[PDB]
């Protein structure tokens, strides 16, 4: 059993580490707006969008009952960006940087839970 406040305490530092990456987190701080970004097929490819602001709202409001649900949303966010964007693109490379940061942060946290 994990209380919501125990999950905020343990997991919020791993989310803050992503926000601290500038400019790499900037494309991830708000939901992808396909009209603004000129990517009209985005929602054909990405069926379940996810981003930092949505993960933060779910963690703050206590919507994760177990740590693996939070980790799954972080990886969904990353995978959506690797799927949609080309491997040579700026956002794809930013995604890979954030994933490296996340792996280093989340692994010790999950060992302690």
């Amino acid at each position: 059993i994990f209380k919501p406040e125990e999950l905020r305490q343990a997991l919020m530092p791993t989310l803050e580490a992503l926000y601290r990456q500038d400019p790499e987190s900037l494309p991830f701080r708000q939901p992808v707006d396909p009209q603004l970004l000129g990517i009209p097929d985005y929602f054909d490819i990405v069926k379940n969008p996810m981003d930092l602001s949505t993960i933060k709202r779910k963690l703050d409001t206590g919507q994760y009952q177990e740590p693996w649900q939070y980790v799954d949303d972080v990886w969904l966010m990353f995978n959506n960006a690797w799927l949609y964007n080309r491997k040579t693109s700026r956002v794809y490379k930013f995604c890979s940087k954030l994933a490296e940061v996340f792996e280093q942060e989340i692994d010790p946290v999950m060992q302690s839970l």
Partner: peptide, 6 residues
């Protein structure tokens, strides 16, 4: 993929 984010 046709489009890149702009």
């Amino acid at each position: 993929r046709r489009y890149q984010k702009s």
